[PDB]
Design brief:
Chain B: Heterodimer of a large and a small subunit. The complex is a heterotetramer, with two copies of chain A (595 residues) and two copies of chain B. With 595 residues, chain A is α+β, with helices and mostly antiparallel strands. Chain A is 39% helix and 14% strand. The longest helix of chain B is centred in the N-terminal third of the chain and has 14 residues, at 49-62. Chain B is α/β, with parallel strands linked by helices and 267 residues long. In chain B, the strands form two sheets. In chain B, strands 2-1-3-6-7 form a five-stranded parallel β-sheet, sandwiched between helices. The chains are: A alpha+beta (595), B alpha/beta (267). The structure holds iron/sulfur cluster (2 copies), FE3-S4 cluster (F3S) (2 copies), cyanide ion (4 copies), fe (ii) ion (2 copies), magnesium ion (MG) (2 copies), nickel (III) ion (2 copies) and 1 more.
């Protein structure tokens, strides 16, 4: 069939079918199927979420105050963001305002997550789509040092001897014949474009990032007890502050703990600016001719908006939200998670049932009733899927739409929204990053003509990858600001951390509903709660990867993952490096997507 | 040769994998490069699809009886097992196949050990812990390392024990290593002096909270929870739930999600 | 401009200086380069002899009333004070001169706070803590930061408090910051559940020792000792005496050397004694 | 006067007198006075220990089991070595053998101390006698990087931008006008011989060492509770081991703690090999024409011997002891701390009294009765010493002699003794260090003629400094061997840590005496105890700096400090960099010296 989608794609499944299951180097479980034409160009793409647990179901009848801990376990990668969404939703429903320090500590935890998550995603999940560790063994260590000094002059770790020592260790691993995670990688595929020196630099940095990442999450351990899965609570934060008073050393937060947080913040800022951002820019330059993967990003993007400089005042959001549609960056449509005509979820192509499957349901009205059923065009059987039937139900992921539009969410969506809204920090990052990119390109090609078209630059798998790194850097700077504000508040006499006015359910209305939003690492997160007589009546989550990994809607619009693969040529369809590189650029969180 | 490890992932949130890489000592980098051979792990591995499946096939045969099977997450039995699909087939079939020729199993976390959040009422997927899925006839050790997630250094401590001392650690009657799971939180809790004196947090951010008083009255489940949180502690010994002001929620114990509200007293 | 600090050294073992440089957060490097101006410190300083002395002279006048005087160790009063000679003169004379124009004093450690080991019986040098040496009429704050030595992050935590919040921390009746010295070790000890159950180490390396049972019966002084060891702990939160299997010896408390054998059992345990 | 000493020095105090009080960048308090001739050459030297506390007096009547904690507080720099000497002396007196694992853990703690102490000494106390931080502001960052890569090819931290960032920080510090610990340094003295680039490298490493040092002592925190001043006990170690049994997480030593120790050991080995040893070698090369300061190391050296590969078997000492006298390295005289004709202390030139001051007292017979009394030729007054009278009593340090000989102690003494006894590890270190030294010399002077004379090379202030660094490296390797042995013991069933057979004084003889020896960081340490009816009847310490810093004896022999200064030319007697450089090379611990 050839399907002409209302969002302007032609999904043609007559070419050769290529199945990727499992999709690895994601959180959770995904299957992807594509069709390639005679020129090995993708002309159809199918996103299937291959897991479901049913947290929305499980929450029914429980106490709203407990909900955050349950939904936190939607995901241990984006650990905490669901807790944050949850407490915000309950506080929205019950009209609870939290103390400033609680707002700040939650933002510090959120920014810690952003940084951790973005760094580990890029190195430990994404990099092997761009980096060939085998080719790193051919690198000249002295030339590697020279490259390093160019990519990041301030990073201290550049000795030729250091790069030689790393190489020796990878050579020994290879020589052992136990290739572990590198086993059967697609290392002879010409889609790998780094020099051996860039491959060695990047493997070196993979190891540096694995050592670093465990440090930043100590911020979560201080404010939240543990990482993964720090604690939260409705009405405040549990980490009470006592700097100077009786028993201060035994309080959660005291002078020594504050000093620890400062140290951790600065370590993260340094890694962002000296290792992560420079790497993504430099790798992008080696891939300057590979501008595939934009998908929906330069037409339809959305975020709820986050990090208001004035608590509870969204016009001060440092990552302002809204929706851009049809590629008009000059028009920011306001997004209201309360409006039943805006966010809606369809299940036409998902493994769920609604009484009227023609309807998209706003999440206060959402329904989660499983319906694992394969289309009669499936190749295989119920328990042995050879080629999934995407004309029928083909995913555990619901189909969210915004006013009927399919949109992309994530750091790239937020960067476009922020750029378009005049956020000068972001504008500076984009322009300086483009300049740095073109500088490295010209080192690689003196004959390089500078890239000036921002939609083409940003609206690509490279751009999606860059935006994530930039966001990490911005989050470190914002987190320092938050820390300094927390210290100022304490200095001016305010050590308060919780509002308990509405702790007791007897203080609650018999009926209430609320929505909590978060700028989660992967995009727009919200939780919608309906409370009845002290219990959860409905609890519906719509998560970033739900948006991005969405199957088709009743009208046939394709979601961000499917759109991003269309039109991409593959060097070797059965070694699908390009598909992995683009899907991974969304940082798919499949446990999140399905919850 | 380095010990072969196959790390499977069922229904999960991936918190146990995340915890593992937080290990302060040994570093995850060193575990993977030098201690074990991490031969399969959906989270970190280069290969996908058919190329990934092929490794499982090869490791199974080549190291038959000689690999450790680490499991994160758990198999669902509802939806014909297709609420967790790997390679077009139920995860349960993958788990069974690899369990059949494992030397031993490590059940990472509360999902693999007990069921964790997806098994909380009404358990829509019939998510089932590994030992129950394999049943009473399973003839190799199943080492339960529970917690949501377990402490990083507990995870790497179990592995370094087996590699250094050449045996399975001693297990309690629930299958948990006595190395880390043979005391309750409350049995080594630094807030215990306050419990003993009737000094409690009564309301969040009260005087008691600001002095680090005991969290029993705000629902701490430390009196019934076996783990190393109050001894080893979390994230390179930085903190644990109670130190940071929230009671234990019981997250290493079988059934903790259905034991009552987290803020209701341990009874 | 950075707060001037003069760090004097009397009769001492140098453990407090050593502890200070163990600080995990802030790092000692950052304290010295960016937070304070460590203008005199015999342990670390470039200048010696006459050039060192000159610094004292200069700071004292340049920053009269505006430097913090940190003191490690203590002055002896026996031997005409010449059991601690600095620049050919008794240390006590140096301490008095610099105390006269200090903004505030920090008594680091048990030596400066109380006397520590040299003051234990029979105190051959008549070693005297700073506050007793200056006497009752001294009109500036003396912040006692006891312990042998104090915890590193406690030492840097006192400094960062003063620099961040622009005041002397609240002190208990003994002059110790409530920030760190307002609980006993035993009031926050993770071995307390064993104390409560009557589960003790009875002999070294017995069953109880290997289970981490309470150290009361082998001499732990945690019941009478105010410090942050069981909360902040030592060396970047790595351990503290009790965690590693030896009772507290009471090392932050006035007179601990003469309280009794370290292996004698602590007193004041019953509320009906 | 002109005094012709039996140990072949001519002490001449007719030239101009230079007084250094305080001697800074030592532990504790020292005064040094010298006389220089018309050529600015030192022709007399006077070592004065300017503090005393009286630990030997304070111990009387107390319980031997408590002693370790009292004497540990002799010194917070060499923290623990006195505790170790104490427990060993009591165990000796009472015939207590400790378990294997207690022996090993004590040795691990000792080697931790050695590494920490040596590193901090070189960078934080010594380096400013060789390094000019103000001149570091003149360095070219790129040339500094080039030097770094040659000095230590494996150290990763070599980026030009890193050195430039360090330089900017020190420039800011200087430009602030608050020069702190650099204020009034002798920075215009031509005695400073490094290039700006070497100064910048060295300042960089000072900072890296300040950051590093706090890590290694975490081994003391694990086994001993805290650092400074870890805990010890008579009969074993308190840190009970439980790897696999009930309540293991609550034991002092469990799997996680052992993994932590391993990590720490490896970090220390790396810093030794990559930073510390290469720096000392390179700085020695810059100072290749400054070979003063050998003193007694040329002739008379002593150590008790330490680190037996087989517990309680000194023939297996990895740093074997003895005494070399009159420069004959072919004759190792055995040293017995029990023999009353060997170690003796005199007080004729010290501020103490004996009933018969002609006597040297073996320490079981030692007396510590203070006698602060200035000679009638003193310039100044009792409480205002202008020029001390070295013809009379002039120090709080007693005068220890070995069979009437003045000796040098310390890492250099131990290296000479080990070399001369065929310890292959040491011989290899010395020869490879010499080879490396000559290579760096040829980098700096392409016409350099290799140094081959080992006595000349080692028997110098440079050689003293090098031996300390080499010892650090050796201690790291030994400590790893000890750790591996500990693991092996536990694996073979032995987790025991204490012997309590003689814990109770009812088990002790009514009268007992014992001696405990240690290879302390600064040289030969021993404690001598006499027990009577459960109490300390006498307790005498003779510590490394007591030996080195000794005043003259009744025959007029000079000690190691005084000897080391004789014949040294000074560029500027009143800016006595040379004096400080040589004194500091002994790593004086003045609190130790006097106790
Ligand atoms: S109830 Fe919880 S906070 Fe209180 S002592 Fe027990 S474990 Fe600690
Ligand atoms: S006596 Fe010591 S070990 Fe026992 S509970 Fe009290 S402080 Fe802890
Ligand atoms: S909630 Fe879990 S992490 Fe530890 S403190 Fe309680 S077992
Ligand atoms: S001996 Fe001192 S270090 Fe702390 S545990 Fe006791 S006050
Ligand atoms: C999820 N981010
Ligand atoms: C998350 N998606
Ligand atoms: C001391 N050495
Ligand atoms: C120590 N001397
Ligand atoms: Fe997510
Ligand atoms: Fe010493
Ligand atoms: Mg949902
Ligand atoms: Mg003595
Ligand atoms: Ni997620
Ligand atoms: Ni010392
Ligand atoms: O997540
Ligand atoms: O996620
Ligand atoms: O997720
Ligand atoms: O010392
Ligand atoms: O010392
Ligand atoms: O010392």
């Amino acid at each position: 069939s050839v399907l002409n989608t209302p969002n302007h794609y032609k999904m043609d499944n007559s070419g050769r079918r290529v199945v990727i299951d499992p999709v690895t180097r994601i959180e959770g479980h995904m299957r992807c199927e594509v069709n390639v034409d005679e020129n090995n160009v993708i002309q159809n793409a199918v996103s299937t979420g291959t897991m479901w647990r049913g947290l929305e179901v499980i929450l029914r009848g429980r106490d709203p105050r407990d909900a955050w801990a349950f939904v936190e376990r939607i995901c241990g990668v984006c650990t905490g963001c669901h807790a944050l969404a949850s407490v915000r939703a309950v506080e929205d429903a019950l009209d609870i305002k939290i103390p400033h320090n609680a707002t700040l500590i939650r933002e510090i935890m959120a920014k810690t997550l952003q940084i951790h998550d973005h760094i580990v995603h890029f190195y430990h999940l994404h990099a092997l789509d761009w980096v060939n560790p085998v080719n790193a063994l051919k690198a000249d260590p002295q030339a590697t040092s020279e490259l390093q000094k160019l990519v990041s002059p301030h990073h201290p770790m550049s000795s030729p001897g250091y790069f030689k020592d790393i190489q020796i260790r990878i050579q020994k691993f290879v020589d052992s014949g136990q290739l572990g995670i590198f086993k059967n990688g697609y290392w002879s595929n010409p889609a790998y474009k780094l020099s051996p020196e860039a491959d060695l630099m990047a493997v070196t940095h993979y190891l540096e990032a694995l050592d670093f990442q465990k440090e930043i999450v100590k911020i979560h351990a201080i404010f939240g007890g543990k990482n993964p899965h720090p604690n939260y609570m409705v009405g405040g934060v549990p980490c009470a502050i006592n700097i100077d008073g009786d028993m201060a050393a035994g309080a959660p937060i005291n002078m020594e703990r504050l000093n620890f947080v400062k140290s951790l913040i600065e370590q993260g800022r340094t890694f962002n600016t000296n290792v992560y951002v420079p790497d993504v820019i430099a790798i992008a330059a080696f891939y300057r001719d590979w501008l595939y993967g934009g998908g929906l990003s330069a037409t339809n993007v959305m975020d709820y908006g986050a990090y208001p400089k004035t608590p509870y005042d969204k016009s001060t959001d440092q990552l302002p939200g809204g929706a851009i549609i049809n590629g008009d960056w000059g028009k920011i449509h306001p997004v209201d998670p309360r409006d039943p005509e805006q966010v809606q979820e369809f299940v036409t192509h998902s493994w769920y049932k609604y009484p009227d499957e023609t309807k998209g349901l706003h999440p206060w009205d959402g329904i989660t009733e499983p319906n694992y059923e394969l289309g009669s065009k499936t190749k295989g059987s119920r328990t042995n899927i050879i080629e999934i039937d995407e004309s029928a139900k083909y995913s555990w992921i619901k189909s969210p739409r915004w006013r009927g539009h399919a949109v992309e969410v994530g750091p790239l969506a937020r960067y476009i929204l922020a750029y378009a809204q005049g956020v000068e920090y972001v504008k500076t990052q984009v322009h300086t990053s483009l300049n740095r990119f073109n500088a490295v390109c010209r080192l690689l090609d003196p004959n390089h003509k500078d890239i000036t078209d921002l939609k083409a630059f940003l609206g690509s798998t490279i751009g999606r990858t860059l935006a994530r790194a930039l966001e990490s850097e911005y989050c470190g700077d914002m987190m320092l600001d938050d820390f300094n504000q927390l210290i100022s508040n304490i200095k001016n006499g305010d050590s308060s951390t919780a509002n308990t006015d509405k702790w007791d359910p007897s203080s609650w209305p018999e009926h209430a509903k609320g929505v909590g939003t978060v700028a989660a690492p992967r995009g727009a997160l919200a939780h919608w709660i309906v409370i009845e007589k002290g219990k959860i009546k409905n609890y519906q989550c719509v998560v970033p990867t739900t948006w991005n990994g969405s199957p088709r809607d009743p009208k046939g619009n394709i979601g961000a993952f499917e759109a991003s693969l269309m039109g991409t040529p593959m060097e070797r369809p059965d070694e699908p490096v390009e598909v992995l590189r683009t899907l991974h650029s969304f940082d798919p969180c499949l446990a999140c997507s399905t919850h | 040769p380095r010990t072969p490890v196959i790390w499977l992932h069922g229904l999960e949130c991936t918190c146990c994998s995340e915890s593992f890489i937080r290990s302060a000592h040994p570093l995850a980098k060193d575990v993977v490069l030098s201690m074990i051979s991490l031969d399969y792990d959906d989270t970190l591995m280069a290969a996908s699809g058919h190329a990934a499946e092929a490794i499982l096939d090869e490791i199974k045969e080549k190291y038959k009886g000689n690999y450790i099977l680490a499991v994160e997450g758990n198999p669902p039995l509802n939806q014909d097992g297709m609420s967790c699909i790997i390679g077009g087939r139920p995860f349960s079939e993958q788990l069974k196949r690899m369990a059949d020729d494992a030397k031993a199993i490590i059940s990472w976390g509360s999902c693999a050990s007990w069921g964790c959040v997806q098994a909380a009422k009404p358990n829509p997927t019939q998510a089932t812990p590994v030992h129950k899925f394999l049943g009473g006839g399973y003839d190799k050790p199943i080492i339960k390392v529970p917690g949501c997630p377990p402490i990083a250094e507990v995870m790497t401590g179990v592995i370094t024990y087996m590699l250094t001392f050449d045996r399975i650690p001693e297990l309690d009657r629930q299958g948990r290593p006595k190395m880390f799971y043979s005391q309750r939180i409350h049995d080594k809790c630094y807030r215990r002096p306050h419990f003993d004196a009737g000094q409690f947090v009564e309301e969040w951010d009260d005087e008691g909270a600001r002095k680090g008083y005991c969290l029993y009255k705000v629902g701490c489940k430390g009196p019934t929870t076996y783990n190393a949180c109050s001894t080893v502690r979390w994230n390179g010994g930085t903190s644990f739930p109670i130190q940071s002001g929230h009671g234990c929620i019981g997250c290493s114990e079988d059934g903790f999600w259905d034991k009552g509200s987290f803020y209701s007293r341990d009874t």
